[PDB]
Amino acid sequence: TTITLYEHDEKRYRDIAGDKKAIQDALIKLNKQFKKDFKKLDRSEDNSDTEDTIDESKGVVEVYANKIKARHYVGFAAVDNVFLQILPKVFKPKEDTWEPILAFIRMLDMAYGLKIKDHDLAYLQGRNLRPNLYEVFIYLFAKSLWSEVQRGYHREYVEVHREEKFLRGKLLMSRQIRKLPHQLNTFSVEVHELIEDNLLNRIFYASVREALRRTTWGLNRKLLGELMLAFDGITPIHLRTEHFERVHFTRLNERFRRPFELAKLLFMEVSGFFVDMNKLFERFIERVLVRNLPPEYKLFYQESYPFSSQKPDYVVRKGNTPVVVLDAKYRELKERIPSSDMLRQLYVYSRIWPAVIVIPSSSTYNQGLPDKPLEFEFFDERKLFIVAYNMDYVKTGAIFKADKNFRRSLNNII
Amino acid sequence: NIKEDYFRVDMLLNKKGQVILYGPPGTGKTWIARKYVVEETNEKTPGNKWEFITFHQSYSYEEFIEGFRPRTDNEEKIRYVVEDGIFKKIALRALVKGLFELEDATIGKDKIHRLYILLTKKEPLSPTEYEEYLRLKRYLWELVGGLPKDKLKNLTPKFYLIIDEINRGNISKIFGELITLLEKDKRLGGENQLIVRLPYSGEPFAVPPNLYIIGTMNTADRSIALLDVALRRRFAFIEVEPRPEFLEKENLKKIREKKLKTEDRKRLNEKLNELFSKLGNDNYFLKTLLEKINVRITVVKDRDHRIGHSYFLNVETVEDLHHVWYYEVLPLLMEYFYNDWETIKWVLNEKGKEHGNVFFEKLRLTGPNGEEAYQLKVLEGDAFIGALKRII
Amino acid sequence: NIKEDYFRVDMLLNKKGQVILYGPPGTGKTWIARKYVVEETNEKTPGNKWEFITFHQSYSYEEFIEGFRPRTDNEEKIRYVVEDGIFKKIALRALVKGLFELEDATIGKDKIHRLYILLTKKEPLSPTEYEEYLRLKRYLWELVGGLPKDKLKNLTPKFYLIIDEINRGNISKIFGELITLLEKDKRLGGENQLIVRLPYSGEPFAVPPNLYIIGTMNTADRSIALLDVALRRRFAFIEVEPRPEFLEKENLKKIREKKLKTEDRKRLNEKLNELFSKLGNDNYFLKTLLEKINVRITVVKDRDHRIGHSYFLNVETVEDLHHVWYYEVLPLLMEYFYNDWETIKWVLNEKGKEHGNVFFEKLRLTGPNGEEAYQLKVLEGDAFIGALKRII
Amino acid sequence: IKEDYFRVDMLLNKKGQVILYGPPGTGKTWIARKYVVEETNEKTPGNKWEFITFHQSYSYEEFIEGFRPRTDNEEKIRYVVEDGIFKKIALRALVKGLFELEDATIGKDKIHRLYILLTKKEPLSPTEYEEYLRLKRYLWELVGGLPKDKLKNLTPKFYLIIDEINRGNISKIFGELITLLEKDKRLGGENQLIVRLPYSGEPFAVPPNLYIIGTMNTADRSIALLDVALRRRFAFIEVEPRPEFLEKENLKKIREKKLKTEDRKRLNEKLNELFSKLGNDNYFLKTLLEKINVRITVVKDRDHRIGHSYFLNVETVEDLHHVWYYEVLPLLMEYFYNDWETIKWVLNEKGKEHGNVFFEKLRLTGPNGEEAYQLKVLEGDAFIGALKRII
Amino acid sequence: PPNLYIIGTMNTADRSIALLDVALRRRFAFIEVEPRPEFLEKENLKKIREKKLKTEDRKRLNEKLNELFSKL
Amino acid sequence: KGKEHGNVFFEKLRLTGPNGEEAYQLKVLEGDAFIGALKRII
Amino acid sequence: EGFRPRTDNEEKIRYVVEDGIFKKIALRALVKGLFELEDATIGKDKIHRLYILLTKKEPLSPTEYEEYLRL
Amino acid sequence: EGFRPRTDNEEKIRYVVEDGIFKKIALRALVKGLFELEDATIGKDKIHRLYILLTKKEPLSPTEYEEYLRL
Amino acid sequence: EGFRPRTDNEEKIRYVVEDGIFKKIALRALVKGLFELEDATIGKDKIHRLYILLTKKEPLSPTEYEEYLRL
Numbered sequence A: 001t002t003i004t005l006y007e008h009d010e011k012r013y014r015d016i017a018g019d020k021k022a023i024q025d026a027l028i029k030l031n032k033q034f035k036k037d038f039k040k041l042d043r044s045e046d047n048s049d050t051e052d053t054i055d056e057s058k059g060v061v062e063v064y065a066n067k068i069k070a071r072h073y074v075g076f077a078a079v080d081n082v083f084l085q086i087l088p089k090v091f092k093p094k095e096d097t098w099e100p101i102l103a104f105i106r107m108l109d110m111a112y113g114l115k116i117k118d119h120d121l122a123y124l125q126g127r128n129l130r131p132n133l134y135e136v137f138i139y140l141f142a143k144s145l146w147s148e149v150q151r152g153y154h155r156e157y158v159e160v161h162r163e164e165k166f167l168r169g170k171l172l173m174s175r176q177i178r179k180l181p182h183q184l185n186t187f188s189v190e191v192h193e194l195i196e197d198n199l200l201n202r203i204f205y206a207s208v209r210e211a212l213r214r215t216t217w218g219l220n221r222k223l224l225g226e227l228m229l230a231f232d233g234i235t236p237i238h239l240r241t242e243h244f245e246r247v248h249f250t251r252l253n254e255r256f257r258r259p260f261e262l263a264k265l266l267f268m269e270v271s272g273f274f275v276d277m278n279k280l281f282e283r284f285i286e287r288v289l290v291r292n293l294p295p296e297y298k299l300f301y302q303e304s305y306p307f308s309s310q311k312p313d314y315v316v317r318k319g320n321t322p323v324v325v326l327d328a329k330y331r332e333l334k335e336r337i338p339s340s341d342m343l344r345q346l347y348v349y350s351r352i353w354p355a356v357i358v359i360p361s362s363s364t365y366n367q368g369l370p371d372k373p374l375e376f377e378f379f380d381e382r383k384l385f386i387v388a389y390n391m392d393y394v395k396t397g398a399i400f401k402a403d404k405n406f407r408r409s410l411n412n413i414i
Numbered sequence B, C: 001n002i003k004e005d006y007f008r009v010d011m012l013l014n015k016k017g018q019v020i021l022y023g024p025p026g027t028g029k030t031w032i033a034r035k036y037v038v039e040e041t042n043e044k045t046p047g048n049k050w051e052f053i054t055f056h057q058s059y060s061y062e063e064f065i066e067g068f069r070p071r072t073d074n075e076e077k078i079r080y081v082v083e084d085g086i087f088k089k090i091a092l093r094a095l096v097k098g099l100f101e102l103e104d105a106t107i108g109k110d111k112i113h114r115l116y117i118l119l120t121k122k123e124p125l126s127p128t129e130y131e132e133y134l135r136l137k138r139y140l141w142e143l144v145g146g147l148p149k150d151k152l153k154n155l156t157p158k159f160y161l162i163i164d165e166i167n168r169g170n171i172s173k174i175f176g177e178l179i180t181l182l183e184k185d186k187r188l189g190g191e192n193q194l195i196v197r198l199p200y201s202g203e204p205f206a207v208p209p210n211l212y213i214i215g216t217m218n219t220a221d222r223s224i225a226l227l228d229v230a231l232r233r234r235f236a237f238i239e240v241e242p243r244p245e246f247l248e249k250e251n252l253k254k255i256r257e258k259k260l261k262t263e264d265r266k267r268l269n270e271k272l273n274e275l276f277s278k279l280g281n282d283n284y285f286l287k288t289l290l291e292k293i294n295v296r297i298t299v300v301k302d303r304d305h306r307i308g309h310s311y312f313l314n315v316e317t318v319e320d321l322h323h324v325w326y327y328e329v330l331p332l333l334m335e336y337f338y339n340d341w342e343t344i345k346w347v348l349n350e351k352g353k354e355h356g357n358v359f360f361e362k363l364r365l366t367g368p369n370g371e372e373a374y375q376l377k378v379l380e381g382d383a384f385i386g387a388l389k390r391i392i
Numbered sequence D: 001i002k003e004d005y006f007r008v009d010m011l012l013n014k015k016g017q018v019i020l021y022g023p024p025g026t027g028k029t030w031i032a033r034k035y036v037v038e039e040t041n042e043k044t045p046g047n048k049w050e051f052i053t054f055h056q057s058y059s060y061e062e063f064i065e066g067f068r069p070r071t072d073n074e075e076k077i078r079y080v081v082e083d084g085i086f087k088k089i090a091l092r093a094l095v096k097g098l099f100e101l102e103d104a105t106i107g108k109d110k111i112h113r114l115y116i117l118l119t120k121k122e123p124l125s126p127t128e129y130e131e132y133l134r135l136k137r138y139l140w141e142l143v144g145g146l147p148k149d150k151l152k153n154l155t156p157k158f159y160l161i162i163d164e165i166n167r168g169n170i171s172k173i174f175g176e177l178i179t180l181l182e183k184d185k186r187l188g189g190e191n192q193l194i195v196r197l198p199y200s201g202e203p204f205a206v207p208p209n210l211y212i213i214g215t216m217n218t219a220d221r222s223i224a225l226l227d228v229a230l231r232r233r234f235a236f237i238e239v240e241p242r243p244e245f246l247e248k249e250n251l252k253k254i255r256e257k258k259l260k261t262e263d264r265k266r267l268n269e270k271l272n273e274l275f276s277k278l279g280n281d282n283y284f285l286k287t288l289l290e291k292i293n294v295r296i297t298v299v300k301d302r303d304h305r306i307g308h309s310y311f312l313n314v315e316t317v318e319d320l321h322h323v324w325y326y327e328v329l330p331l332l333m334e335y336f337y338n339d340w341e342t343i344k345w346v347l348n349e350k351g352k353e354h355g356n357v358f359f360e361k362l363r364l365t366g367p368n369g370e371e372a373y374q375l376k377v378l379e380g381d382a383f384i385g386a387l388k389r390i391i
Numbered sequence E: 001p002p003n004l005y006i007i008g009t010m011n012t013a014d015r016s017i018a019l020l021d022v023a024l025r026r027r028f029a030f031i032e033v034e035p036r037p038e039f040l041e042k043e044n045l046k047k048i049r050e051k052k053l054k055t056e057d058r059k060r061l062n063e064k065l066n067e068l069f070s071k072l
Numbered sequence F: 001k002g003k004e005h006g007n008v009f010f011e012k013l014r015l016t017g018p019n020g021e022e023a024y025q026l027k028v029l030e031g032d033a034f035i036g037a038l039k040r041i042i
Numbered sequence G, H, I: 001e002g003f004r005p006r007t008d009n010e011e012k013i014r015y016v017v018e019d020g021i022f023k024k025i026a027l028r029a030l031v032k033g034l035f036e037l038e039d040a041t042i043g044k045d046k047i048h049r050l051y052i053l054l055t056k057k058e059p060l061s062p063t064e065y066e067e068y069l070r071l
C-alpha cells in the first residue's frame, strides 16, 4: 500500500488502503529506526525532546488509535510494502499529486546541496506515472548513473604482481632471477591492468541490485535492468557503511559523484531518509538571501551566547556595522501576528546583536498569505523594527518570478 | 530468403571492410557468418583461407596480435621467442598469399613462397626455422613499403576471420593496433596506408585489403555500452533480427529437408504433421507464438533481448517443444528479467492468474513483510498446449 | 588542405613540440596527422623519418622507452637483457641523425655513424654487437654533455612520432620519464637542458629537439579521457570539430577527386550529380543533415559524442546512403540513446510522428506499468528521402 | 628572485629533503634545476647530481637495489644484485665525503679506489666487481668506527633531484629509505641508523651530503603524498602560480635573460606591439591570470589553478590566441566536462549568451528543456574585447 | 567428439545461475536438483539405509529408527 | 572560524561561487604579526 | 594442455607439453569410438596402440612419448 | 612435492623430486599402516626399510636416494 | 628463508638457499645463547664454528656453506 502525508496532516484508518494492522506494524519499526539514526541530521529550533518523544513511537509519525498524524519531518520511507512519503504542507493543493513532488525535490535541490538537473525532473512531468518519492530518487540515481556509464565505464587501474603465462607490463626482476628452472615457464610480472570491478563498481552493482528488487515503476525497471546488464561481470557485494567510506573522489572518478551521493542517500530493513522541515526552509532561504542581498554579505549560523547559546538562523552585516537579524521560521503565522514563542526569540536575537530583525515565512495557496509588500512592522517598546517578510513560492514551477518580488521587498527593507 | 542476408553482408564487406552481426542469441549470427564464408571461399574447415576464433573475458592482446610466450625448442629447455597471435598469423598470411598473384619486377616469389609455408605450418615453429621465419618476415615489410598503392588494392584471395562473440572480450584492448588499421582506408594499398610499428616484436605491421573480420556479437550479454568510437565506426553493424517467419509448417519443413536425406524428409513430414495437429491444426502456430512473445520482450525490456529462432527450429513433436520451452526459453526468460515474476507473467499474459495452468504459480505462504515468491511449474500433455494457446 | 588544419598544426607543433588532435570519431584526426607528416618528411611509409605507433591498454612502459625484455640467445635461452622501446629508438635516432652536421663531435663522427647504423638496423641486435651499441650509447650522452646549447637548437632533420589513440594507454605510466621532458624548453638545446637518468639501463636520456609527437586521442569515451593536468600542459590540444562543410556538392567533388586523380573523374561527377538530383537538387543537403544531427546531439548528449564527417564522406548513391544510414549511424544512434526512445525520435525530428514514413514505428501494444517502446522500419526508395527531408 | 632560491637552501639544511609542491604550470622543476646548477656549478647530470623522475613502473628493485643479470663476457650470465639509482648516489656521496677527513677514516687508498669504481661509466667487469663488493664491505666496517663529529660535516653537497615524487608509488619505491630521510637519522646525526637491506644483505645508511629536492604536482589528487609519515620527512615548499611574472616589465626581464642583445631588440618591439593591442596597459596578463586563478580557486580547488608557464612564452597577440584556444581553454573544458553554467562563470560571461562570447548559445533547445553551448573561435580585436571582459 | 558429455555440478548457495559467465548459461543446460524431503519418511529412510548395511545391521537399523520416531 | 581577514593564515577570497561556494588562500605572515596569529590559537 | 617440467635420467629440467584432463578424455573418446567404425579400419592397429597409451599412467620415457605424438 | 637441486657430483648437479611434508606424512602413515598388516606380508622386511627413510630427519643422501625411489 | 642463485667465479648457477634477515638473527641468538653455557652442548668449538659462519660479511663459499648446513 502507498500512503502519503503532508506536514501536520492526518489520515483515517477506515478510508486507508490495505489492512489496519499492517500500517501500524510498519510505523513502529520506522519510528524506532528514526530513534537510532536521529543524531545524524541537524536541526534548527526543532524542540525535538530527544529523550522522551522520539522513543515513544512519535519520532516521524504519530500513530494513534483512530488516525495517523505526521510530525514536521519531511521526506519519505519504505517499510514492509507500506511506502510512506511526507511532503511539506506549503506545497499542498486546494497528476493531482504530481506538482508537490517536483516542488519538494527542487526545494531539496537548492537547500540540501544536491546537484541534480532540471531536465531530469522535467522528463517525468506529464507521463502519468504514480507519484512516489522512492520511485523518483531511484530514477534520479539510475538516470544519472546510466548517463555517466554510457560515456565511460570507470575502469580504474590497480597493479597486481601476477604470474602470467604471457608477458604484460613491467617484468619483476627480483622475482624472476630467483625463479628455479623447473618453474621458468611462467613470467612473473607486475602489470598495471585496468579492472572493471573496482570498489565504485561493486557499490553500483549492489546499489542497483537493491534498487531493482524494491522498485515499482515501469520506467525504473527498464533503466535498472540495463544498468544491471552493463555490470554483469562484477562480483556482487553486501552493502555496508564501510564500503561507502572506503572510496575517495579523485579526478578520474569525479563524474561519478552525482550517482554515488544519491546511492549513499538511499542505501547503507528501512530505506530512504528524513530531514527536518524547519532546517530545510532555513537552508532554502539562505540560498535566496545571499543571491538577493548584494549590498550586505550574509552568514548563516552566526552565534552570540547569552548569559546556553541562542543563535539566529541567519544574520546579514555589511562589514560589521549593520545588525539585521533574519530568523527563518516554518510557522504559519496565523492572524497576521507572530506567536508567543516566535516574538520572544525575535526580541533576544535583536538585543544581543539598535538592530532590526526580519522573519521570513512561507506563502502559497495552502499557507497563510499576507499582502505583497512587507506586511507587518512591529516595535517592541525599545525602538525595535520587526518586519514580517513573506516569500512567495513559484518553486512548484521552474521559473523564479517571486525572487524578483522578494528582492523588491528586501530593497525597501534594506 | 537467406541469399539477401548473404548479399547484405557481401555489400557491406566490400564497402566498410568488416561487419558485426549483432543480434539476440539463438538467431543464426554464428551460422550466417560461417555459411557465408564457406559459400564464398569453398573451404569447409578453418586454417588456410579463414580462421574461426571466439572471444572470452580473459582473452588478451598477446594471444591476438603478438606477445612474449615461453616455447619449447626441440624437446629441451624453454626459450622466450615472441609468438604471433591468431590475427597476425592470418594478416601476414593474407598478405603473402595475395602477393603470389601480383606480377611485379621486385617480388621475391621464391622468398614469399617460403614465408607462406612457414605461416601455414600447423606445427609450432622450431628455432632452426623460426629465425628463417623472422628474417623472411623482415623481407616482407621491406618489400611492402616499396610497392606502390596501385599494386596493393587488387589482391585476389579474400581472407576471412569469424570473430565469434566480439563483445564478450574487451574490444578496445584486443584490437590494440586494429582500431587505427581496420578501416578500409587504413589498410594496405588504400589512400591512407599505415604500417604500424608493434611494441613486442618491434617489426612493422599493417592489415592487407584481403582480410575481412566478420563479427558475431551477442547482445543479451555485455550490452550496447560499447567503445562507441573506435570499435563502432570501423564495424558496419548488421542487425540479424530473430525471424519467426522460419517457424511455420512449410518453413520448418523446408529447413529440415534440404539438410536431410531421402528417408529423413518423409519422417520429418510425418513428425511435423503430428506436432501441428496436436496444437490445434494451426500451421502458423510457432510463428504466432514467437512473434507474440517477442513483442512483449521489446516493450518491457530492450528490443535486443528477444528470444531467437534457433531454439524452435529443431522440434518434431510436442515433447521436444516441451524440452525447448523449459530449458532454452524459460531459463533464458528468467535470466533477462532478473528473477522477476510480476513482469515475467505479463510476457505470457498470465498476470492475473495463479495456481492453474500457469508457468509461474504463486506459493501459498507469503513472507514476513508481505512479499510473495513464485515458482516455476512443469506441465505436460494438453495442459501445456492449453498453457501455450493463451500466450497468443 | 593547407588552409586551416595543416597550417595550425605546423605552427603549433613547431612552437609547443607536441600536438594532440582531440575530437569526436569520424573527423580527420588520424588523417590530418598522417597527411601532415608525409607532406613534410616526403616519406609515405614509416621507418627512417617517422614512426606510426598506436597506444592500447596492453601497452607497457617497458616496451615504450626502456624495460627488461627476455631475449633468445643460442646457448643460453633465457637471457634477460634491457631493450630500448620505440621512443628510445626514435629519440636516439633523431639525435644521431641530427648530429651529423655538428662541429664538436670531430673525434667520433665515425662513432655517430656507427651508432646510427645500429639504430636503423631492423635485424635483432646480436650480443656481440649489443655491447658495441651500449658503448656507443654511453659515448653519445658524454658528447652532448660537452655540446653547447647554442649548437643543439637547430638540428636539420625533423623526426615525428605519430602516436594514435594516445588516451587509450596509461599515459602517466607510458610517459614515465617523458612527463618532464616533453616541453620545448626542456628538450636538448632548450633553455633548461634536462638529461634524466633512466631506471633499468642506468644510462642518461634526453629527448632531442628534432622529435615531435602528434597524438590523436579520442574524446567520445570518457573513462579513457586525458584529465592529467600536469600532462595537458606538455601537449597543445587542437579541437578538430566534425565539419559538415565537407559534405556539400562542390566539396564532395573536390575531396574525392583530389585523392583519386585517375580518369574516373567523369564517373564520380555524373554519379554525384545523380545523387543530389535525387535529393531534390539540394547542393547543401548532406551539409544540413550532419549539421542538424550534430546540433541535436550536442544539446542532449555531450558535445564530444557528435557524428563525424567520415560516415557520409564515402557516399555515392541513394543506395549507398541507405547502406551508410541503416548500418553505420542508425545503430550508432541506438547506441547513444539505448532504449531512450523519446530522445532518439527527437534527434531525427520525428517527435510527434509515430506512423508512416518514419524510421521508428510505434508498437500498438503498451506495457503493464504504462511503458511503451518503438520498433525500427527499414525504409527504401523515395520514402527514405521523405524520412530524411524531415530532419533538415 | 633569490627568495625561492634561498628558501630551498634553508630547508635543505633543516629538514634535509625539500618538496616543491604546487599547481602545474609554475616554476617547480625550473627552480629545482636552477638551484642545483647554481650550487654545484655542473650544468649536466653526472657525479655531483643526478636527475631522475618517478612513475608507476619505477619500482624498488631499480631505485635502491635489486637483482640484475650482468656478465660483461657474452657468457656465464651472473645473477648478481646491483645497486639502484639511489644507492649508487648515497655510496658515492659517502666516499666523496671521506676524502677531506684528516685521520678519522683511515682508508685513503681504499676509499679513492671505491670512488673510481663508483663513478666509472663503463659497466663493471667481474674481476673488478669483486673488488667493488669487497671495498663496500670495508666501507660499512669503516663507517661505525668513526666519531659523529667527523661524520656530520662532510663537505661536497650531493643532490638527487627527483621529479613527480607523487606519481610513483612513493611508499614502495622508498624501501629502507622510509626511516632514513630525517636530518638526524643519517650518518653523523644524533641517532644514526646503519639499516640492513633485504636483497644483498649489506648494511646501508644515507650520508649527510645527499639532499633530495623532489618536485610534484598536486592537481591530480588521485596520486598526492597523503602518507602522513612521508610528510614528516620532507619540507613542503608552496610554489603557487605567481602572475607577477606576466607584467610588461617582468616579462621583459625574464624573456630577455639569455639573448646577448641580438634578438632582444626584436623581442622588445614585439612586446611593445603586444601590449599596444591589449589597451596600452602594462598589467594585462597579470590580472588575467589573477582573475582566472581566483575564479578557479572558489570553484574547483586551490590546486587546479592555471600556472604561468602557459602565458610566459607569448610574443604577439597571435601567440596569445594560440595559447588561449589550444592550451588553457581545452584545459578549462576538461575541468568542467559538460558542466556549462560553471565554465561560463570562470570567464564571467554568465549573462552573456551570444555575440563576443567564447561559448555561444545554440539556437536549439531540448525535449526535456535542456540546452548546451558551442565553442566560438574568435579572431582579431574582437578576441581581446572578449578577453578584457574577464578582468 | 560427440561422445564426451559434460555433466556439471553446481553448488548455487553462493553463486546463482544468473551470476555465471555468459558462455555457460547457453552452452550448457540446467537441471535443478531440488531438495526432496520425501527421502526422510519412516519407510524411505529404512530403504535408503538398507542398501549400505548387512542383514544383521538392518534389524539394529530397524530398532534404532523405531526408537527415533517414537521419541518424536 | 569567525576571523576572515587580518592576522589570519587563511584570508577569504572576496567573491563566492555561482552556487554558494567560497574558498580561501594561505596567507604568508612574518614577524610579530605571525605570533599574533599564532597566540590566538591558544 | 600446458607446460610441465620433466627430468631426463637425473639431468637438467626438460620442459615437455603434457595434456590436461579435458584433452585426455576427448582424445580418449575419439580413439575408443574409432574401433567400431568400418571406415577407420585402415589404421585399426595404430589407433588401438593410442588407446592403450592414453589410458595408462605416467609415460616414463620420451621413446613412447614421441610415439604418442606421432600417433 | 617439487624440484630441488642436490649435492651430487661437481659438474653433475641434478634436479630430483624432493617430497614435501604432506606427501611425507601420508606415506609415513601408509608405511606404518602396512607394517602391522597381516595380508601385506609379501615384502614386510622392505616396508620397515621404507619407514626408516621416512623418519630420517635430514636431507636424503644421493647414493641411497634411488633406494628411496625404488622402495 | 628463500631461494637464491649464486655463481661465484666460474661455476654453474647452483641454486643455494639463502637465509633471510630473521634466520640470521634467530640462529645467531641461539648459537650465542648456547656458547655461554655447558650442560649438554658438546662441541663448543663446533658451536663456535657455526657462529663464525653466521657473522660472515662475505657470502659463503660452497666448500664452507655445506659445512654450515651440516652444523
Ligand SMILES: Nc1nc2c(ncn2[C@@H]2O[C@H](COP(=O)(O)OP(=O)(O)OP(O)(O)=S)[C@@H](O)[C@H]2O)c(=O)[nH]1
Pocket: B185, B192, B229, B230, B233, C023, C024, C025, C026, C027, C028, C029, C030, C031, C032, C216, C217, C218, C219, C246, C255, C309, C310, C313
Ligand atoms: N580528404 C579528406 N578526407 C577526410 C577529411 N576528414 C576526414 N577524412 C576521411 O575520413 C576517414 C577516416 O577519418 P579518421 O581521421 O581516420 O578518423 P579517426 O580520427 O581515426 O577517428 P577515431 O576512431 O580515431 S576517433 C579517412 O578516410 C579520411 O579520408 C578531410 O578533411 N579531407
Ligand SMILES: Nc1nc2c(ncn2[C@@H]2O[C@H](COP(=O)(O)OP(=O)(O)OP(O)(O)=S)[C@@H](O)[C@H]2O)c(=O)[nH]1
Pocket: C179, C180, C185, C186, C191, C192, C230, C231, C233, D023, D024, D025, D026, D027, D028, D029, D030, D031, D215, D216, D217, D245, D254, D308, D309, D312
Ligand atoms: N625565468 C623564469 N621562468 C619560469 C618561472 N616559472 C616557470 N618558468 C618557466 O616555465 C617553464 C615551465 O616550468 P616547469 O618548471 O617546467 O613547470 P613544472 O612545475 O615542472 O610542470 P610539472 O608538470 O612538472 S608540474 C620552464 O621552462 C621555466 O623556464 C620563473 O619563475 N622564472
Ligand SMILES: Nc1nc2c(ncn2[C@@H]2O[C@H](COP(=O)(O)OP(=O)(O)O)[C@@H](O)[C@H]2O)c(=O)[nH]1
Pocket: B002, B024, B025, B026, B027, B028, B029, B030, B031, B032, B255, B309, B310, B313
Ligand atoms: N537451415 C537453417 N538453419 C538455421 C538458420 N538460422 C539458424 N539456424 C540454426 O541455428 C543454429 C545455430 O545457432 P547459433 O548461430 O549458434 O545461435 P547464436 O550464435 O547463439 O546466435 C544451427 O543449428 C542452425 O541449424 C537458417 O536460416 N537456416
Ligand SMILES: [Mg+2]
Pocket: B029, B030, B164, B165, B216
Ligand atoms: Mg554465437
Ligand SMILES: [Mg+2]
Pocket: B179, B180, C029, C030, C164, C165, C216
Ligand atoms: Mg585514429
Ligand SMILES: [Mg+2]
Pocket: C179, C180, D028, D029, D163, D164, D215
Ligand atoms: Mg616537473
